[PDB]
Ligand binder design. Structure first.
Ligand SMILES: O=S(=O)(O)OC[C@H]1O[C@H](O)[C@H](OS(=O)(=O)O)[C@@H](OS(=O)(=O)O)[C@@H]1OS(=O)(=O)O
Length: 217
């Protein structure tokens, strides 16, 4: 069989399932590296013994066993990297998919909040609906930027083939949010009191979730 992780269906707690699967993978990997490193040790002690006894046959053993070892390592290193990338692609797909859903639904509550307003003062509801939408888009930025961060440290290469993309995402997020704020222009009664609150909340919420940094670049 495979990991139970790949066939889930609520995705509601993806972070926890992923973080969990990642340990089961990470740990399973540590199981193998230990087994190899131990094999190396037994192999290596042997060389030290037959060192002065069979210096010719002994030495051949060292060259030989290095090739094997070197190879077995590279083999493992790849497998892990392969599996790691398989679990992430999946993860990043559900997270994006699930984030989108929040956007999708947060918008609905928003546009209803506004339609209901036309008739009667959905005042407070409109805002809490907007702030919800904002939290959703901003969470999309925070996770994206963060992915660029991990890739900047893992693959300074894979990383570069993402920047144009990251820049494209962060742009439309701002656009979508600004366009979603524009929808208030029509309710003058309401754009006068709700807007300045929601914009401050956007600047505030972004300051908390995805700050600035001074350490490095
Ligand atoms: O898999 S879940 O158990 O649903 O994830 C819960 C939270 O896990 C981390 O705190 C998550 O933090 S993270 O840095 O690892 O994304 C956090 O994301 S965040 O609130 O948007 O910041 C998650 O909160 S959630 O409401 O977005 O699901």
């Amino acid at each position: 069989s495979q990991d139970p992780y790949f066939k889930i269906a609520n995705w509601t707690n993806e972070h926890d399932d992923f973080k969990k699967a990642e340990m089961r993978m990470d740990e399973k990997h540590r199981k193998k590296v230990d087994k190899v490193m131990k094999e190396w040790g037994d192999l290596e002690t042997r060389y030290n013994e037959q060192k002065a006894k069979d210096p010719k046959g002994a030495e051949k053993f060292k060259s030989q066993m290095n090739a094997r070892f070197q190879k077995t390592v590279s083999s493992l290193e790849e497998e892990h990297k392969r599996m790691r990338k398989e679990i992430e692609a999946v993860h990043e797909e559900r997270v994006q998919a699930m984030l989108n859903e929040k956007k999708r639904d947060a918008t609905h509550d928003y546009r209803q909040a506004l339609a209901t307003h036309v008739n009667k003062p959905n005042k407070h509801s409109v805002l809490q609906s907007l702030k919800a939408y904002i939290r959703a888009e901003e969470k999309d930025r925070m996770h994206t930027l963060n992915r660029y961060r991990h890739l900047l440290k893992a693959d300074s290469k894979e990383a570069a083939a993402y920047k144009p993309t990251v820049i494209h995402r962060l742009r439309y997020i701002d656009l979508r949010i600004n366009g979603t704020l524009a929808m208030l222009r029509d309710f003058p009664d309401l754009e006068k009191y709700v807007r300045p609150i929601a914009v401050t909340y956007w600047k505030d919420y972004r300051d908390e979730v995805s700050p600035d940094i001074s350490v490095e670049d």
